[PDB]
Amino acid sequence: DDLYG
């Protein structure tokens, strides 16, 4: 689960 991109 990417939180940034």
Next chain:
Amino acid sequence: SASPAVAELCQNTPETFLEASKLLLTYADNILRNPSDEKYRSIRIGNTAFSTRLLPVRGAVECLFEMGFEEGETHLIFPKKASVEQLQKIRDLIAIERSS
């Protein structure tokens, strides 16, 4: 340490509080523990997790602002000028409420 944003965050249901506070801690800790890694200093406003699990939650974006994030057009950015101290302060306040 009497944060309006953290107090508002705590007014959410237990479930939503946990979900949102967890994300907030991660955003803080990634910066605190990797201060030279620029990738943790910008959060895309349209990122699925951020836009669906954090931004809609009362108090949560304001916690980022109190940490020192600034809102740009497409991202929230933790700017060069922002102190780790203020970032740490909010992280500590949220963590107490998660342990509480």
